Amino acid sequence: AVVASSHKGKQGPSFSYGELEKQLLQANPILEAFGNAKTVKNDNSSRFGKFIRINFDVTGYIVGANIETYLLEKSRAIRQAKDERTFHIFYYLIAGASEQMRNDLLLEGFNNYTFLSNGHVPIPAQQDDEMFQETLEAMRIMGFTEEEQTSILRVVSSVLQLGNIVFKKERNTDQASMPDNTAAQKVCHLMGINVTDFTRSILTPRIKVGRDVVQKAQTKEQADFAIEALAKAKFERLFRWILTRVNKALDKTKRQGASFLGILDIAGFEIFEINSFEQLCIN
C-alpha cells in the first residue's frame, strides 16, 4: 500500500495514500472484528481463511484489488467452551453501546443471554469501548452510511436476543410451548414481522411436503435446533453482506490489468478438547 501506489503529483506514516489503499488498510481491522475470537492457542485467532490480491498496470502501479474469504468456524459462536470467546464485535457492541443505542437495539448488559455460555469472558490488551468506536469509524472510512451501520447492529442484536426465546414442553402432547413470549415479541419487532406467525412457525409449523401442506410435530429440542439454525442463517447472510460490501468499494476500478500479486492467509493448525468437522477442514 506504499510501494505499489501511483503518484498523484501532489514524508512519514501519516502520508495521504490513494483511495483504494486507504480502503485496503481499513479492510483488515473491519474483517478481524467480525471474524476473529479468543482461543486457547491465540487471543486474536482468525475463524476464517482469506486471500487478498492487488492488480497492476503496465507501468507497474496498483489499479485495483480483491478480497476473497472462505468458510468460517461459525458453530462456536453460541456453544462456547471454557474461557473461549465469541466474535469480538459482540463484546464490543455490548460494552460500547450508548444508552440511546441500547434502547434502539433492545439490548442489555452481559450474562443476560442464553446463547452466552461462561458469561462474559475477558481478553488482555484490548479496550472494548474504544474498539467499538474505532471499528465503526473504520466502516465510516470505508464509506458506510449511518443507516447501513445501525442495520448491522439490529441484525447482530437479533441473533444475540433470539437465544432468550426459552421453550418448555407440554408433557400431554410432547409439543413445545413458549412461556417467555416477550422475547419472541422483541425479536419479531426487530425483524419487522408478525408475532403470531413467528411464534407458531417455531412451536408448531405447517410445512409443504410435495402436494400437501401439513402440521409438523415439534419437540423442545427441534425448536431449539430451529432457532439456533436461524441464528446461523442470519449470521451467514450478514457476513456475506459485509464481504460483498467491502469488495464493492474496490469494484469502482476498471476491468483492465497487466498482472497481479496475491497474499494468502489461512487459519493455522488448531486443536482442543473437541474435534468436530468444523476444525477438520482447516487442519
Binding site: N181, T182, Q185, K186, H189, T196
Partner: protein
Amino acid sequence: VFQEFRQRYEILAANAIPKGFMDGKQACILMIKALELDPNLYRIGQSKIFFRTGVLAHLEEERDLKITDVIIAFQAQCRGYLARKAFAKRQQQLTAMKVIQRNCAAYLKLRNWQWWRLFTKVKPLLQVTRQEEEMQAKDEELQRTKERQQKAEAELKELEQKHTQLCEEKNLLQEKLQAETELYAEAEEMRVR
C-alpha cells in the same frame, strides 16, 4: 390466545397497560379488571382464555362505536385544517391582488394621459428595444430547443432502460427454455425406456 386478545383490544386499556414487551397475560388481566367483568363470564387458561360470546361481542360493538367517535373527531380536525388552509390562501391572494390592481389601474390611467403621449411618438426609433426583442426571441427559441433536447434524452433513457430489461428477460427465458427442453428430452427418453 392472550396475545391475540391483547393485540385486538388493547385500545380499551392503553392507559392502564404499561408500555414495553411485557407479559400479555398480565395486560389481559388488567384489561378484564378495567372492564370489571364478572368472573363467571370468562375462564383463564395458560394460553387460551375462554369467554362468553354475547359479552365479548357487546364489548366489541362498544369498542367499535368508540373508534367511530375518534374517527369523527379526526374528520373535524382535518376539515378544520382544510378550512384554515383555504382561508389562509384566499385572504393572502385577496390582499396581494387588491394592492396590485390598485397600482396597475392607477398607473394605466395616468400613462394614457401624461408625457407617455410624447414618448410613444419617439419610441419606434429606439433601436435598443428592437435588438432586445431579437435577443429575447433567440433566447426563447434556444430555451425551447433545450427543452426538446431534455425530452429527447429522457425518452432515450426510458427506451434504454426498457431495452436492457427486455434483453435480460430474453436471456433468462432462453436459458429457462433450454433447461425445459433438456428436461423434456430426459423425461421422454426414460418414458420410452
